[PDB]
Design an enzyme around this catalytic site. Structure first.
Site, PDB file in Angstrom:
ATOM      1  N   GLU A  98       0.796  -1.220   0.000  1.00  0.00           N
ATOM      2  CA  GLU A  98       0.000   0.000   0.000  1.00  0.00           C
ATOM      3  C   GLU A  98       0.831   1.274   0.000  1.00  0.00           C
ATOM      4  OE1 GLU A  98      -2.939   0.067   3.070  1.00  0.00           O
ATOM      5  OE2 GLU A  98      -3.906  -1.784   2.361  1.00  0.00           O
ATOM      6  N   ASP A 105      -6.321  10.654  -0.374  1.00  0.00           N
ATOM      7  CA  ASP A 105      -6.628   9.338  -0.914  1.00  0.00           C
ATOM      8  C   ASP A 105      -7.595   9.481  -2.092  1.00  0.00           C
ATOM      9  OD1 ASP A 105      -9.102   9.864   0.192  1.00  0.00           O
ATOM     10  OD2 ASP A 105      -8.999   8.282   1.707  1.00  0.00           O
ATOM     11  N   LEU A 112      -6.205   7.246   7.459  1.00  0.00           N
ATOM     12  CA  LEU A 112      -7.086   8.371   7.210  1.00  0.00           C
ATOM     13  C   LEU A 112      -7.024   9.315   8.401  1.00  0.00           C
ATOM     14  CD1 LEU A 112     -10.167   9.540   7.930  1.00  0.00           C
ATOM     15  CD2 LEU A 112      -9.335   9.842   5.594  1.00  0.00           C
ATOM     16  N   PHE A 153      -7.117  -5.412   5.564  1.00  0.00           N
ATOM     17  CA  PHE A 153      -6.783  -4.044   5.192  1.00  0.00           C
ATOM     18  C   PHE A 153      -7.265  -3.731   3.783  1.00  0.00           C
ATOM     19  CE2 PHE A 153      -4.068  -1.583   8.064  1.00  0.00           C
ATOM     20  CZ  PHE A 153      -3.855  -2.494   9.082  1.00  0.00           C
ATOM     21  N   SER A 182     -11.880 -21.025   0.900  1.00  0.00           N
ATOM     22  CA  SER A 182     -10.463 -20.779   1.152  1.00  0.00           C
ATOM     23  C   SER A 182     -10.193 -20.624   2.638  1.00  0.00           C
ATOM     24  CB  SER A 182      -9.990 -19.537   0.394  1.00  0.00           C
ATOM     25  OG  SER A 182      -9.926 -19.772  -1.001  1.00  0.00           O
ATOM     26  N   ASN A 227      -7.191 -22.137  -4.537  1.00  0.00           N
ATOM     27  CA  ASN A 227      -8.561 -21.630  -4.521  1.00  0.00           C
ATOM     28  C   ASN A 227      -8.598 -20.112  -4.415  1.00  0.00           C
ATOM     29  OD1 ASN A 227     -11.472 -22.880  -4.294  1.00  0.00           O
ATOM     30  ND2 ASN A 227     -11.454 -21.127  -2.886  1.00  0.00           N
TER      31      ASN A 227
END
Ligand SMILES: O=P(O)(O)O[C@H]1[C@H](OP(=O)(O)O)[C@@H](OP(=O)(O)O)[C@H](OP(=O)(O)O)[C@@H](OP(=O)(O)O)[C@H]1OP(=O)(O)O
Length: 290
Positions: free
Chosen positions: A140, A149, A161, A233, A246, A261
């Protein structure tokens, strides 16, 4: 007695002078440990408040030599525990790391010692925080100045944020409140990691409140737990909770089936590189992809 006297009269409000007098106390007599031990404790506390961590470290090494024979193990471990507990609230990652490693080395063979294990756990968690911070930095990005953002909202660090207000000053005020100083919109890597650790603790609580994620999360090791936190996240709790098959295979430690998967999801198709790294982490249980 004057070692007594020096120590007691020393506690004062010109810290440099007080510290130099404490140095006086080690210099004055020292060898009998109790008073030199208390003086070194005081100096460590005073340097921790003065933000001179090198000196704090050097005087902490001095204190450790006292515990082998100069001071009772109960008392020394009390003091070191106090030091630990009032430095557990520090953004200073490298200081914490060095402190932990020195404590571990010093208490390795200490008979009937219980603090080695506490510090060792703390260092393990510190390494874990470092790894997760780097993982999310890679996936990120890290930014040490306030930025907007994709919604136009004021943000900093790793996607932290700050505010939805259009006022840049409102963002700076929130940032100053969260960091505790006049940052003028700029922060250090360490402050970014403090905010990020807060965001991680939040995401972990959320995972634990999610009835579908709590089982898998519990079942996993620390590394795979970080991969799961990464997904949270990126998509949020309920978004992750949609990986029913999964998630079950993961909870079963069917690493390769789980990876296969997960690769067929829309998440992979949309962000293939990040999904690739995350799935590698789920599969191998290592940080190699990062
Ligand atoms: O009891 P005080 O005279 O008010 O001072 C105390 C005391 O230090 P001294 O006995 O040397 O004066 C404690 O030390 P010990 O008696 O247990 O050896 C120490 O506790 P720590 O073990 O944590 O160092 C404590 O610090 P704190 O009150 O934050 O726990 C410190 O208070 P001050 O340093 O602020 O004077």
């Amino acid at each position: 007695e004057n070692q007594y006297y020096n120590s007691k009269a020393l506690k004062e409000d010109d810290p440099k002078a007080a510290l130099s007098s404490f140095q006086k106390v080690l210099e004055l007599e020292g060898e009998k440990g109790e008073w030199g031990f208390k003086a070194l404790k005081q100096m460590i506390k005073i340097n921790f408040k003065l933000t001179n961590f090198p000196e704090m470290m050097n005087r902490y090494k001095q204190l450790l030599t006292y515990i082998r024979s100069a001071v009772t193990r109960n008392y020394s471990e009390k003091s070191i525990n106090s030091i630990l507990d009032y430095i557990s609230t520090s953004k200073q990652m490298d200081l914490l790391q060095e402190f932990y490693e020195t404590t571990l080395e010093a208490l390795k063979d200490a008979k009937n010692d219980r603090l080695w294990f506490k510090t060792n756990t703390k260092l393990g968690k510190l390494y874990l925080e470092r790894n997760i911070f780097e993982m999310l930095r890679i996936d990120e990005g890290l930014r040490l100045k306030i930025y907007k953002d994709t919604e136009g909202y004021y943000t900093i660090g790793i996607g932290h944020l700050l505010t939805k207000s259009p006022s840049l000053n409102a963002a700076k005020s929130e940032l100053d409140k969260a960091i505790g100083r006049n940052t003028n919109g700029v922060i250090t890597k360490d402050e970014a990691e403090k905010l990020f650790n807060q965001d991680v603790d939040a995401a972990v609580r959320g995972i634990l409140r999610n009835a579908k994620l709590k089982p898998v999360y519990d079942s996993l090791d620390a590394v795979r737990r970080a991969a799961l936190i990464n997904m949270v996240f990126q998509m949020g709790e309920t978004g992750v909770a949609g990986f029913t098959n999964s998630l079950r295979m993961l909870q079963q430690k069917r690493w390769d089936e789980a990876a296969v998967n997960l690769a067929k999801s829309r998440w992979y198709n949309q962000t293939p590189n990040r999904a690739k790294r995350v799935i590698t982490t789920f599969r191998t249980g290592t940080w190699d992809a990062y």
